[PDB]
mmCIF file of C-alpha atoms in Angstrom:
data_model
loop_
_atom_site.group_PDB
_atom_site.id
_atom_site.type_symbol
_atom_site.label_atom_id
_atom_site.label_comp_id
_atom_site.label_asym_id
_atom_site.label_seq_id
_atom_site.Cartn_x
_atom_site.Cartn_y
_atom_site.Cartn_z
ATOM 1 C CA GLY A 1 -25.546 -20.836 -45.299
ATOM 2 C CA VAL A 2 -23.947 -17.314 -45.122
ATOM 3 C CA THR A 3 -24.043 -15.331 -48.353
ATOM 4 C CA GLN A 4 -22.348 -11.966 -49.153
ATOM 5 C CA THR A 5 -22.820 -9.527 -52.030
ATOM 6 C CA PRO A 6 -20.790 -8.432 -53.980
ATOM 7 C CA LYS A 7 -17.785 -10.749 -54.181
ATOM 8 C CA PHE A 8 -15.551 -7.932 -55.376
ATOM 9 C CA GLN A 9 -15.801 -4.171 -55.671
ATOM 10 C CA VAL A 10 -13.554 -1.383 -56.759
ATOM 11 C CA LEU A 11 -14.163 2.151 -55.349
ATOM 12 C CA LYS A 12 -12.872 5.670 -55.900
ATOM 13 C CA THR A 13 -11.667 7.254 -52.656
ATOM 14 C CA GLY A 14 -14.618 9.000 -51.078
ATOM 15 C CA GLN A 15 -17.353 6.800 -52.581
ATOM 16 C CA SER A 16 -19.572 4.957 -50.099
ATOM 17 C CA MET A 17 -20.647 1.278 -50.259
ATOM 18 C CA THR A 18 -22.938 -1.357 -48.748
ATOM 19 C CA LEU A 19 -21.823 -4.958 -48.359
ATOM 20 C CA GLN A 20 -24.779 -7.328 -47.866
ATOM 21 C CA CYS A 21 -24.661 -10.333 -45.606
ATOM 22 C CA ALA A 22 -27.523 -12.880 -45.349
ATOM 23 C CA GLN A 23 -28.000 -16.022 -43.368
ATOM 24 C CA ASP A 24 -31.234 -18.027 -43.582
ATOM 25 C CA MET A 25 -30.170 -20.260 -40.674
ATOM 26 C CA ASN A 26 -32.127 -18.249 -38.083
ATOM 27 C CA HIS A 27 -28.816 -17.506 -36.421
ATOM 28 C CA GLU A 28 -29.004 -14.712 -33.894
ATOM 29 C CA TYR A 29 -25.360 -13.731 -33.735
ATOM 30 C CA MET A 30 -23.620 -11.910 -36.674
ATOM 31 C CA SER A 31 -20.189 -10.279 -37.169
ATOM 32 C CA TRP A 32 -18.147 -8.472 -39.734
ATOM 33 C CA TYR A 33 -14.373 -8.838 -39.888
ATOM 34 C CA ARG A 34 -11.799 -7.392 -42.188
ATOM 35 C CA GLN A 35 -8.670 -9.416 -43.137
ATOM 36 C CA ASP A 36 -5.451 -7.756 -44.099
ATOM 37 C CA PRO A 37 -2.220 -9.295 -45.434
ATOM 38 C CA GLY A 38 -0.216 -10.014 -42.320
ATOM 39 C CA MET A 39 -2.936 -9.176 -39.799
ATOM 40 C CA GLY A 40 -5.524 -11.963 -39.838
ATOM 41 C CA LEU A 41 -9.185 -11.367 -39.011
ATOM 42 C CA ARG A 42 -10.118 -8.172 -37.192
ATOM 43 C CA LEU A 43 -13.701 -7.647 -35.779
ATOM 44 C CA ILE A 44 -15.490 -4.523 -37.067
ATOM 45 C CA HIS A 45 -18.994 -4.655 -35.640
ATOM 46 C CA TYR A 46 -21.229 -7.384 -34.356
ATOM 47 C CA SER A 47 -24.845 -8.045 -33.365
ATOM 48 C CA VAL A 48 -26.256 -10.388 -30.768
ATOM 49 C CA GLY A 49 -29.778 -10.118 -32.352
ATOM 50 C CA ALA A 50 -32.289 -7.841 -34.156
ATOM 51 C CA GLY A 51 -32.172 -4.183 -33.020
ATOM 52 C CA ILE A 52 -28.805 -4.675 -31.329
ATOM 53 C CA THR A 53 -25.318 -3.906 -32.626
ATOM 54 C CA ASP A 54 -22.023 -3.386 -30.727
ATOM 55 C CA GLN A 55 -18.573 -2.211 -31.854
ATOM 56 C CA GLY A 56 -15.458 -4.414 -32.260
ATOM 57 C CA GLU A 57 -11.686 -3.791 -32.573
ATOM 58 C CA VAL A 58 -11.734 -1.583 -35.701
ATOM 59 C CA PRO A 59 -15.157 0.054 -35.886
ATOM 60 C CA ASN A 60 -14.042 3.354 -37.419
ATOM 61 C CA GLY A 61 -15.345 4.347 -40.845
ATOM 62 C CA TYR A 62 -18.106 1.675 -40.870
ATOM 63 C CA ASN A 63 -21.769 1.435 -39.805
ATOM 64 C CA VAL A 64 -24.039 -1.574 -39.487
ATOM 65 C CA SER A 65 -27.693 -2.299 -39.099
ATOM 66 C CA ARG A 66 -29.515 -5.336 -37.803
ATOM 67 C CA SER A 67 -33.241 -4.873 -38.408
ATOM 68 C CA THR A 68 -34.017 -8.474 -39.050
ATOM 69 C CA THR A 69 -32.538 -11.792 -37.993
ATOM 70 C CA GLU A 70 -31.539 -12.593 -41.606
ATOM 71 C CA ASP A 71 -29.479 -9.592 -42.710
ATOM 72 C CA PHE A 72 -26.503 -7.694 -41.405
ATOM 73 C CA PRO A 73 -25.444 -5.092 -43.941
ATOM 74 C CA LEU A 74 -22.144 -3.204 -43.580
ATOM 75 C CA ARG A 75 -21.842 0.284 -44.897
ATOM 76 C CA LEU A 76 -18.596 2.073 -45.826
ATOM 77 C CA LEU A 77 -19.199 5.771 -45.265
ATOM 78 C CA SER A 78 -16.317 7.200 -47.248
ATOM 79 C CA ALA A 79 -13.800 4.957 -48.997
ATOM 80 C CA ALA A 80 -10.094 5.439 -48.133
ATOM 81 C CA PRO A 81 -7.169 3.425 -49.557
ATOM 82 C CA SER A 82 -6.614 2.000 -46.058
ATOM 83 C CA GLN A 83 -9.926 0.202 -46.428
ATOM 84 C CA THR A 84 -8.674 -1.996 -49.288
ATOM 85 C CA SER A 85 -9.156 -5.401 -47.734
ATOM 86 C CA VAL A 86 -11.252 -8.591 -47.727
ATOM 87 C CA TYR A 87 -14.387 -8.397 -45.565
ATOM 88 C CA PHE A 88 -15.989 -11.517 -44.095
ATOM 89 C CA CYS A 89 -19.428 -11.816 -42.576
ATOM 90 C CA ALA A 90 -19.783 -14.607 -39.981
ATOM 91 C CA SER A 91 -22.725 -16.040 -38.016
ATOM 92 C CA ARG A 92 -23.523 -18.421 -35.131
ATOM 93 C CA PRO A 93 -26.742 -19.741 -33.523
ATOM 94 C CA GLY A 94 -26.152 -17.409 -30.575
ATOM 95 C CA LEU A 95 -28.317 -18.896 -27.833
ATOM 96 C CA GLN A 96 -20.440 -23.781 -28.434
ATOM 97 C CA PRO A 97 -19.346 -21.106 -30.930
ATOM 98 C CA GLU A 98 -18.590 -22.653 -34.291
ATOM 99 C CA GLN A 99 -18.491 -19.647 -36.629
ATOM 100 C CA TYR A 100 -19.742 -20.048 -40.248
ATOM 101 C CA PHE A 101 -18.230 -17.511 -42.650
ATOM 102 C CA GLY A 102 -19.582 -16.002 -45.853
ATOM 103 C CA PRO A 103 -17.313 -16.350 -48.903
ATOM 104 C CA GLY A 104 -15.872 -12.823 -48.397
ATOM 105 C CA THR A 105 -15.899 -9.487 -50.267
ATOM 106 C CA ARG A 106 -12.732 -8.180 -51.694
ATOM 107 C CA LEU A 107 -12.631 -4.384 -51.976
ATOM 108 C CA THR A 108 -10.066 -2.196 -53.726
ATOM 109 C CA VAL A 109 -10.077 1.565 -53.178
ATOM 110 C CA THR A 110 -8.365 3.645 -55.836
ATOM 111 C CA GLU A 111 -7.518 7.352 -56.318
ATOM 112 C CA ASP A 112 -8.719 7.294 -59.937
ATOM 113 C CA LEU A 113 -10.991 4.932 -61.945
ATOM 114 C CA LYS A 114 -8.748 5.491 -64.958
ATOM 115 C CA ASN A 115 -6.530 2.896 -63.287
ATOM 116 C CA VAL A 116 -9.100 0.180 -63.966
ATOM 117 C CA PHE A 117 -8.237 -2.225 -66.746
ATOM 118 C CA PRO A 118 -9.802 -5.588 -67.864
ATOM 119 C CA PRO A 119 -7.493 -8.549 -68.403
ATOM 120 C CA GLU A 120 -6.350 -9.645 -71.857
ATOM 121 C CA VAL A 121 -6.450 -13.492 -71.838
ATOM 122 C CA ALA A 122 -4.584 -15.937 -74.101
ATOM 123 C CA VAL A 123 -4.203 -19.769 -74.079
ATOM 124 C CA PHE A 124 -0.813 -21.212 -75.099
ATOM 125 C CA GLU A 125 -0.967 -24.598 -76.755
ATOM 126 C CA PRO A 126 1.185 -27.537 -75.536
ATOM 127 C CA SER A 127 4.780 -28.119 -76.639
ATOM 128 C CA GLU A 128 5.322 -30.969 -79.048
ATOM 129 C CA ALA A 129 8.512 -31.743 -77.098
ATOM 130 C CA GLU A 130 6.454 -32.162 -73.909
ATOM 131 C CA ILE A 131 4.095 -34.453 -75.725
ATOM 132 C CA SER A 132 6.885 -36.691 -77.008
ATOM 133 C CA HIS A 133 8.841 -36.716 -73.705
ATOM 134 C CA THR A 134 6.022 -37.141 -71.205
ATOM 135 C CA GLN A 135 2.919 -38.266 -73.188
ATOM 136 C CA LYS A 136 1.065 -35.383 -71.384
ATOM 137 C CA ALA A 137 0.123 -31.964 -72.639
ATOM 138 C CA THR A 138 0.140 -28.751 -70.632
ATOM 139 C CA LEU A 139 -1.894 -25.708 -71.810
ATOM 140 C CA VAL A 140 -1.168 -22.336 -70.199
ATOM 141 C CA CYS A 141 -3.717 -19.520 -69.718
ATOM 142 C CA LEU A 142 -2.216 -15.976 -69.136
ATOM 143 C CA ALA A 143 -4.374 -13.096 -67.928
ATOM 144 C CA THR A 144 -2.381 -9.812 -68.252
ATOM 145 C CA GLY A 145 -2.789 -6.073 -67.787
ATOM 146 C CA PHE A 146 -5.700 -6.018 -65.271
ATOM 147 C CA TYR A 147 -6.470 -3.795 -62.287
ATOM 148 C CA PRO A 148 -7.670 -4.122 -59.662
ATOM 149 C CA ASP A 149 -6.720 -7.695 -58.658
ATOM 150 C CA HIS A 150 -10.352 -8.870 -58.895
ATOM 151 C CA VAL A 151 -10.498 -11.931 -61.141
ATOM 152 C CA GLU A 152 -11.649 -15.572 -61.010
ATOM 153 C CA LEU A 153 -9.981 -17.849 -63.556
ATOM 154 C CA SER A 154 -11.631 -21.166 -64.505
ATOM 155 C CA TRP A 155 -10.983 -23.934 -67.081
ATOM 156 C CA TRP A 156 -13.723 -25.476 -69.125
ATOM 157 C CA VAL A 157 -13.213 -28.657 -71.160
ATOM 158 C CA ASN A 158 -16.082 -29.517 -73.592
ATOM 159 C CA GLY A 159 -18.304 -27.020 -71.855
ATOM 160 C CA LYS A 160 -17.854 -28.272 -68.265
ATOM 161 C CA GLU A 161 -15.693 -26.688 -65.554
ATOM 162 C CA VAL A 162 -12.717 -28.866 -64.646
ATOM 163 C CA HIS A 163 -10.642 -28.870 -61.393
ATOM 164 C CA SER A 164 -8.355 -31.882 -61.806
ATOM 165 C CA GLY A 165 -5.032 -31.299 -63.591
ATOM 166 C CA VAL A 166 -5.250 -27.559 -63.062
ATOM 167 C CA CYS A 167 -3.212 -25.142 -61.029
ATOM 168 C CA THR A 168 -3.568 -21.342 -61.020
ATOM 169 C CA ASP A 169 -1.113 -18.942 -59.376
ATOM 170 C CA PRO A 170 -2.350 -18.231 -55.904
ATOM 171 C CA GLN A 171 -1.444 -14.513 -56.421
ATOM 172 C CA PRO A 172 -0.925 -12.149 -59.355
ATOM 173 C CA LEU A 173 2.448 -10.774 -60.294
ATOM 174 C CA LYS A 174 2.502 -6.916 -60.287
ATOM 175 C CA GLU A 175 3.466 -5.857 -63.741
ATOM 176 C CA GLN A 176 5.314 -2.772 -62.184
ATOM 177 C CA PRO A 177 6.105 -3.907 -58.689
ATOM 178 C CA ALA A 178 7.284 -0.400 -57.753
ATOM 179 C CA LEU A 179 4.033 1.414 -58.878
ATOM 180 C CA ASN A 180 1.207 1.764 -56.407
ATOM 181 C CA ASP A 181 -1.718 0.995 -58.692
ATOM 182 C CA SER A 182 0.373 -1.518 -60.756
ATOM 183 C CA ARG A 183 -1.591 -3.640 -63.234
ATOM 184 C CA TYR A 184 -1.448 -7.490 -62.647
ATOM 185 C CA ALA A 185 -0.869 -10.797 -64.488
ATOM 186 C CA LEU A 186 -2.058 -14.328 -63.498
ATOM 187 C CA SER A 187 -1.186 -17.695 -65.080
ATOM 188 C CA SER A 188 -2.844 -21.130 -64.921
ATOM 189 C CA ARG A 189 -1.904 -24.467 -66.267
ATOM 190 C CA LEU A 190 -4.183 -27.344 -67.355
ATOM 191 C CA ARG A 191 -2.463 -30.618 -68.044
ATOM 192 C CA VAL A 192 -4.242 -33.464 -70.024
ATOM 193 C CA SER A 193 -2.993 -36.588 -71.752
ATOM 194 C CA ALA A 194 -1.330 -36.208 -75.123
ATOM 195 C CA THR A 195 -4.103 -38.392 -76.629
ATOM 196 C CA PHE A 196 -6.836 -36.102 -75.230
ATOM 197 C CA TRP A 197 -5.079 -32.973 -76.469
ATOM 198 C CA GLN A 198 -4.687 -34.737 -79.878
ATOM 199 C CA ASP A 199 -8.447 -35.150 -80.466
ATOM 200 C CA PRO A 200 -9.624 -32.202 -82.667
ATOM 201 C CA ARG A 201 -13.132 -32.455 -81.227
ATOM 202 C CA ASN A 202 -11.937 -31.526 -77.698
ATOM 203 C CA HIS A 203 -12.341 -27.906 -76.605
ATOM 204 C CA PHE A 204 -10.287 -26.016 -74.050
ATOM 205 C CA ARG A 205 -11.383 -22.619 -72.722
ATOM 206 C CA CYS A 206 -9.787 -20.431 -70.059
ATOM 207 C CA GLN A 207 -12.422 -18.062 -68.614
ATOM 208 C CA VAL A 208 -11.451 -14.974 -66.579
ATOM 209 C CA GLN A 209 -14.310 -13.186 -64.808
ATOM 210 C CA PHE A 210 -13.103 -9.590 -64.125
ATOM 211 C CA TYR A 211 -14.945 -7.322 -61.661
ATOM 212 C CA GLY A 212 -14.616 -3.640 -62.698
ATOM 213 C CA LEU A 213 -16.792 -0.551 -63.304
ATOM 214 C CA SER A 214 -20.582 -0.683 -63.746
ATOM 215 C CA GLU A 215 -23.019 0.868 -66.186
ATOM 216 C CA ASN A 216 -23.177 4.290 -64.458
ATOM 217 C CA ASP A 217 -19.529 5.139 -63.931
ATOM 218 C CA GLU A 218 -18.254 7.894 -66.209
ATOM 219 C CA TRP A 219 -15.901 6.978 -68.993
ATOM 220 C CA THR A 220 -14.155 9.406 -71.330
ATOM 221 C CA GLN A 221 -10.913 7.525 -72.163
ATOM 222 C CA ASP A 222 -9.899 6.304 -75.608
ATOM 223 C CA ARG A 223 -10.361 2.582 -74.590
ATOM 224 C CA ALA A 224 -13.562 0.643 -73.919
ATOM 225 C CA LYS A 225 -14.976 1.239 -70.451
ATOM 226 C CA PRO A 226 -13.530 -1.475 -68.069
ATOM 227 C CA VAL A 227 -16.882 -2.956 -66.913
ATOM 228 C CA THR A 228 -17.346 -6.283 -65.054
ATOM 229 C CA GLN A 229 -17.110 -8.818 -67.895
ATOM 230 C CA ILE A 230 -15.895 -12.259 -68.818
ATOM 231 C CA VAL A 231 -12.736 -12.401 -70.916
ATOM 232 C CA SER A 232 -11.869 -15.798 -72.291
ATOM 233 C CA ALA A 233 -9.598 -17.639 -74.751
ATOM 234 C CA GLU A 234 -9.770 -21.124 -76.182
ATOM 235 C CA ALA A 235 -8.020 -23.766 -78.140
ATOM 236 C CA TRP A 236 -9.274 -26.894 -79.997
ATOM 237 C CA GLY A 237 -7.354 -30.109 -79.830
ATOM 238 C CA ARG A 238 -5.094 -30.783 -82.882
ATOM 239 C CA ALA A 239 -3.355 -33.989 -84.046
ATOM 240 C CA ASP A 240 -0.689 -31.338 -84.571
ATOM 241 C CA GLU B 1 -3.170 -11.288 -27.546
ATOM 242 C CA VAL B 2 -3.034 -14.188 -30.022
ATOM 243 C CA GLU B 3 0.387 -15.001 -31.478
ATOM 244 C CA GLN B 4 1.064 -17.747 -34.067
ATOM 245 C CA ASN B 5 4.425 -19.030 -35.415
ATOM 246 C CA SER B 6 5.670 -17.262 -38.501
ATOM 247 C CA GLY B 7 5.270 -18.858 -41.962
ATOM 248 C CA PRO B 8 5.114 -19.910 -44.645
ATOM 249 C CA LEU B 9 6.176 -23.357 -43.364
ATOM 250 C CA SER B 10 7.236 -25.971 -45.916
ATOM 251 C CA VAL B 11 6.406 -29.530 -45.020
ATOM 252 C CA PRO B 12 7.332 -32.558 -47.140
ATOM 253 C CA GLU B 13 4.349 -34.628 -48.136
ATOM 254 C CA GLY B 14 3.884 -37.332 -45.449
ATOM 255 C CA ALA B 15 5.520 -35.341 -42.602
ATOM 256 C CA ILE B 16 3.888 -33.409 -39.773
ATOM 257 C CA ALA B 17 2.863 -29.808 -40.126
ATOM 258 C CA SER B 18 3.164 -28.238 -36.734
ATOM 259 C CA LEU B 19 1.515 -25.016 -35.786
ATOM 260 C CA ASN B 20 1.247 -23.170 -32.604
ATOM 261 C CA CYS B 21 -0.341 -20.271 -30.957
ATOM 262 C CA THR B 22 0.062 -18.442 -27.673
ATOM 263 C CA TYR B 23 -2.633 -16.467 -25.941
ATOM 264 C CA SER B 24 -1.956 -13.825 -23.276
ATOM 265 C CA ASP B 25 -5.199 -14.011 -21.189
ATOM 266 C CA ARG B 26 -4.893 -17.108 -18.888
ATOM 267 C CA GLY B 27 -8.680 -17.068 -18.315
ATOM 268 C CA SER B 28 -9.542 -18.045 -21.892
ATOM 269 C CA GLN B 29 -12.138 -20.752 -22.107
ATOM 270 C CA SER B 30 -12.315 -21.984 -25.691
ATOM 271 C CA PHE B 31 -9.818 -22.685 -28.493
ATOM 272 C CA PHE B 32 -10.199 -23.099 -32.232
ATOM 273 C CA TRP B 33 -8.319 -23.804 -35.401
ATOM 274 C CA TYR B 34 -9.553 -22.600 -38.731
ATOM 275 C CA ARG B 35 -8.355 -23.643 -42.170
ATOM 276 C CA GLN B 36 -8.379 -20.987 -44.914
ATOM 277 C CA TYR B 37 -7.521 -21.955 -48.536
ATOM 278 C CA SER B 38 -6.188 -19.155 -50.646
ATOM 279 C CA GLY B 39 -9.029 -16.736 -51.768
ATOM 280 C CA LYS B 40 -11.494 -18.652 -49.659
ATOM 281 C CA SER B 41 -13.209 -18.271 -46.269
ATOM 282 C CA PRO B 42 -12.026 -19.611 -42.841
ATOM 283 C CA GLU B 43 -13.472 -22.977 -41.968
ATOM 284 C CA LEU B 44 -13.552 -24.375 -38.491
ATOM 285 C CA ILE B 45 -11.612 -27.595 -38.235
ATOM 286 C CA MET B 46 -10.859 -28.113 -34.527
ATOM 287 C CA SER B 47 -12.368 -27.058 -31.230
ATOM 288 C CA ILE B 48 -10.607 -27.672 -27.967
ATOM 289 C CA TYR B 49 -11.748 -26.851 -24.455
ATOM 290 C CA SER B 50 -9.859 -28.965 -21.919
ATOM 291 C CA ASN B 51 -6.132 -29.551 -21.389
ATOM 292 C CA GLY B 52 -4.557 -32.349 -23.500
ATOM 293 C CA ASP B 53 -5.063 -34.024 -26.895
ATOM 294 C CA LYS B 54 -7.984 -34.040 -29.290
ATOM 295 C CA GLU B 55 -7.923 -35.931 -32.596
ATOM 296 C CA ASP B 56 -9.981 -35.778 -35.772
ATOM 297 C CA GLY B 57 -8.822 -37.580 -38.895
ATOM 298 C CA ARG B 58 -5.239 -36.506 -39.398
ATOM 299 C CA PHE B 59 -5.657 -33.492 -37.097
ATOM 300 C CA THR B 60 -4.413 -33.453 -33.546
ATOM 301 C CA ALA B 61 -5.084 -30.326 -31.497
ATOM 302 C CA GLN B 62 -3.353 -29.802 -28.155
ATOM 303 C CA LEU B 63 -4.034 -27.388 -25.325
ATOM 304 C CA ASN B 64 -1.661 -26.607 -22.498
ATOM 305 C CA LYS B 65 -3.402 -24.087 -20.280
ATOM 306 C CA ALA B 66 -0.345 -24.362 -17.976
ATOM 307 C CA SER B 67 2.048 -23.098 -20.699
ATOM 308 C CA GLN B 68 -0.764 -21.011 -22.348
ATOM 309 C CA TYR B 69 -0.366 -22.418 -25.903
ATOM 310 C CA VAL B 70 -2.530 -24.347 -28.246
ATOM 311 C CA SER B 71 -1.024 -26.260 -31.106
ATOM 312 C CA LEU B 72 -2.267 -28.103 -34.147
ATOM 313 C CA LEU B 73 -0.449 -31.014 -35.824
ATOM 314 C CA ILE B 74 -1.515 -32.260 -39.244
ATOM 315 C CA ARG B 75 -0.229 -35.830 -39.640
ATOM 316 C CA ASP B 76 0.657 -37.502 -43.001
ATOM 317 C CA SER B 77 0.442 -34.089 -44.650
ATOM 318 C CA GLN B 78 -0.917 -33.984 -48.233
ATOM 319 C CA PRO B 79 -0.486 -31.209 -50.830
ATOM 320 C CA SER B 80 -4.223 -30.568 -50.537
ATOM 321 C CA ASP B 81 -3.578 -29.403 -46.894
ATOM 322 C CA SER B 82 -1.692 -26.368 -48.224
ATOM 323 C CA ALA B 83 -3.550 -23.448 -46.646
ATOM 324 C CA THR B 84 -3.412 -20.763 -43.938
ATOM 325 C CA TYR B 85 -4.252 -21.997 -40.518
ATOM 326 C CA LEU B 86 -5.611 -19.555 -37.980
ATOM 327 C CA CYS B 87 -5.820 -19.854 -34.191
ATOM 328 C CA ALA B 88 -8.776 -18.228 -32.486
ATOM 329 C CA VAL B 89 -9.261 -17.794 -28.769
ATOM 330 C CA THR B 90 -12.432 -16.909 -26.812
ATOM 331 C CA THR B 91 -12.719 -14.616 -23.777
ATOM 332 C CA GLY B 92 -17.959 -16.119 -26.891
ATOM 333 C CA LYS B 93 -16.167 -13.227 -28.656
ATOM 334 C CA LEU B 94 -13.219 -14.455 -30.801
ATOM 335 C CA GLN B 95 -9.743 -13.059 -31.122
ATOM 336 C CA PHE B 96 -7.774 -14.315 -34.162
ATOM 337 C CA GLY B 97 -4.084 -14.866 -34.724
ATOM 338 C CA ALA B 98 -2.425 -13.625 -37.910
ATOM 339 C CA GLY B 99 -2.413 -17.193 -39.317
ATOM 340 C CA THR B 100 0.430 -19.499 -40.517
ATOM 341 C CA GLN B 101 0.705 -20.505 -44.161
ATOM 342 C CA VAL B 102 1.547 -24.148 -44.650
ATOM 343 C CA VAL B 103 2.898 -25.405 -48.076
ATOM 344 C CA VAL B 104 2.927 -29.217 -48.333
ATOM 345 C CA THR B 105 5.312 -30.069 -51.185
ATOM 346 C CA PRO B 106 4.610 -33.181 -53.294
ATOM 347 C CA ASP B 107 6.973 -36.153 -53.240
ATOM 348 C CA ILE B 108 7.877 -36.116 -56.989
ATOM 349 C CA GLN B 109 8.402 -39.805 -57.886
ATOM 350 C CA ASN B 110 9.983 -39.600 -61.341
ATOM 351 C CA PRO B 111 11.356 -36.081 -61.884
ATOM 352 C CA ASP B 112 12.053 -35.076 -65.509
ATOM 353 C CA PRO B 113 12.926 -31.374 -65.213
ATOM 354 C CA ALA B 114 12.514 -29.545 -68.531
ATOM 355 C CA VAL B 115 11.682 -26.219 -70.109
ATOM 356 C CA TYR B 116 9.257 -26.014 -72.936
ATOM 357 C CA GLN B 117 8.148 -23.156 -75.116
ATOM 358 C CA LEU B 118 4.400 -22.817 -75.769
ATOM 359 C CA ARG B 119 2.802 -20.676 -78.474
ATOM 360 C CA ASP B 120 -0.381 -18.737 -78.569
ATOM 361 C CA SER B 121 -3.339 -20.555 -80.026
ATOM 362 C CA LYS B 122 -4.463 -17.229 -81.678
ATOM 363 C CA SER B 123 -1.563 -15.072 -82.908
ATOM 364 C CA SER B 124 1.276 -17.728 -83.000
ATOM 365 C CA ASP B 125 3.633 -14.689 -82.615
ATOM 366 C CA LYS B 126 3.439 -14.791 -78.798
ATOM 367 C CA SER B 127 4.809 -17.506 -76.469
ATOM 368 C CA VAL B 128 5.458 -18.411 -72.821
ATOM 369 C CA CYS B 129 8.093 -20.734 -71.244
ATOM 370 C CA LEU B 130 6.981 -23.530 -68.915
ATOM 371 C CA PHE B 131 9.483 -25.120 -66.469
ATOM 372 C CA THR B 132 7.877 -28.365 -65.340
ATOM 373 C CA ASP B 133 8.355 -31.820 -63.719
ATOM 374 C CA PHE B 134 11.206 -30.787 -61.375
ATOM 375 C CA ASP B 135 11.496 -32.141 -57.809
ATOM 376 C CA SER B 136 10.217 -30.167 -54.833
ATOM 377 C CA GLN B 137 13.747 -29.257 -53.557
ATOM 378 C CA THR B 138 14.186 -27.320 -56.762
ATOM 379 C CA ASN B 139 14.539 -23.610 -56.554
ATOM 380 C CA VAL B 140 12.885 -21.255 -59.004
ATOM 381 C CA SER B 141 14.461 -17.788 -58.656
ATOM 382 C CA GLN B 142 12.935 -14.440 -59.708
ATOM 383 C CA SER B 143 14.077 -12.806 -62.973
ATOM 384 C CA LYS B 144 17.309 -10.852 -63.338
ATOM 385 C CA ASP B 145 15.086 -8.410 -65.333
ATOM 386 C CA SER B 146 11.997 -6.102 -64.980
ATOM 387 C CA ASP B 147 10.602 -7.152 -68.409
ATOM 388 C CA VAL B 148 10.749 -10.918 -67.695
ATOM 389 C CA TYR B 149 8.083 -12.359 -65.415
ATOM 390 C CA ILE B 150 8.419 -15.661 -63.556
ATOM 391 C CA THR B 151 5.646 -17.220 -61.444
ATOM 392 C CA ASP B 152 6.085 -19.103 -58.159
ATOM 393 C CA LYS B 153 5.950 -22.863 -58.536
ATOM 394 C CA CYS B 154 2.523 -24.385 -58.556
ATOM 395 C CA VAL B 155 1.557 -28.006 -57.919
ATOM 396 C CA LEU B 156 -0.956 -29.726 -60.240
ATOM 397 C CA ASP B 157 -2.664 -33.055 -59.576
ATOM 398 C CA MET B 158 -3.792 -35.186 -62.575
ATOM 399 C CA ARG B 159 -6.190 -37.494 -60.701
ATOM 400 C CA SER B 160 -6.764 -39.277 -64.052
ATOM 401 C CA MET B 161 -3.191 -40.586 -63.790
ATOM 402 C CA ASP B 162 -2.350 -40.432 -60.045
ATOM 403 C CA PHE B 163 0.261 -37.908 -61.079
ATOM 404 C CA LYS B 164 1.375 -34.633 -59.592
ATOM 405 C CA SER B 165 3.851 -32.208 -61.033
ATOM 406 C CA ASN B 166 5.487 -28.902 -60.215
ATOM 407 C CA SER B 167 5.603 -26.083 -62.666
ATOM 408 C CA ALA B 168 6.416 -22.365 -63.047
ATOM 409 C CA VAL B 169 5.715 -20.191 -66.034
ATOM 410 C CA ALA B 170 7.727 -17.327 -67.489
ATOM 411 C CA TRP B 171 7.114 -14.716 -70.201
ATOM 412 C CA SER B 172 8.418 -11.462 -71.641
ATOM 413 C CA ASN B 173 7.721 -8.788 -74.248
ATOM 414 C CA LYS B 174 11.285 -8.295 -75.439
ATOM 415 C CA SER B 175 11.545 -10.344 -78.688
ATOM 416 C CA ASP B 176 14.709 -12.382 -79.184
ATOM 417 C CA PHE B 177 13.450 -13.591 -75.739
ATOM 418 C CA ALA B 178 14.344 -17.164 -75.260
ATOM 419 C CA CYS B 179 13.194 -19.651 -72.706
ATOM 420 C CA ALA B 180 16.886 -20.285 -72.431
ATOM 421 C CA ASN B 181 17.128 -16.915 -70.493
ATOM 422 C CA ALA B 182 14.046 -17.292 -68.478
ATOM 423 C CA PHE B 183 14.879 -19.646 -65.619
ATOM 424 C CA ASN B 184 18.262 -18.807 -63.966
#
């Protein structure tokens, strides 16, 4: 189907960037949209086939290239804060226009890379009171202190990703809602039976994948360089 | 111009979510509804071309070229339908509306509203407060305080028990912080 690289990217104002879009469906038509809170999808550029590209509603600041039928890269010439957004590549056979969308690229443009921070992650074990009232056991994962808002939180029980009994906040809280580059927090809950939580051989891990700086960004600060990394926390079941 | 009704719209589980969309250009040929889950990509769920009704599963799309609106009804709404729905119109170049968020709240069968305090599995010094098992009419208000954080409510589905529940989580740095303060 349609694939996009990277999923997330932070930039310093001025830096340039290339978002990749690929589609091995021999589709001839390809588009890039940006999506902004409260605006929906806005067309940036599009291409009817190889060698051909045309502008859309908001073409300014971006170039494209369609050399082949498979790829439609989008290039950001010079990052500005106003280009913080989620970009989606989309394709259709071309020649009844169902559009298929890539999974999207979320981009954050910041004044200074010193603003970048990885999350700290902790798992909070279930209340005994909950256990005795409800016979169910809720664990909470909290990811705190991170910037930009580029995380994916997952739960893993005995080594396998779980989706049932989970719910993660659909958006981060700003830790300083007034501050422009505020750091963020995100919580998730995983709820299992009391009996399952009570088995000491059962393992519960909250994984947060953070997208941050790469090997090649400068770092002089007192703290570890905030690179793309996985930060995780766990708990073992306990009869209690 | 593509204009959709303003959200988020709350819909009790089982009811009808009803979305609409006006387009300015009367010579538009093709009409679409996309579903977008939070953090995810738009997915085409309905195409409509001629005046009238079109059905697929629990979806009913309707086009009234006369009045220049398209609508989308989701029947017997389920919590898993919570999403943003976008209207797109063709002139096959697409113009997209700003989308309407729908929130389908669960019918909580046996509410048992309660606040519990949970401790860190590592340090044991740190905790969070969890408000859970309240009914979907229940209001969770923001903190009366910049050092106390309170999430929006979140719906979780334990398919292993056919059991859904609402929850919201709070926490703070200020010690002598009690769950007792947190939800008010």
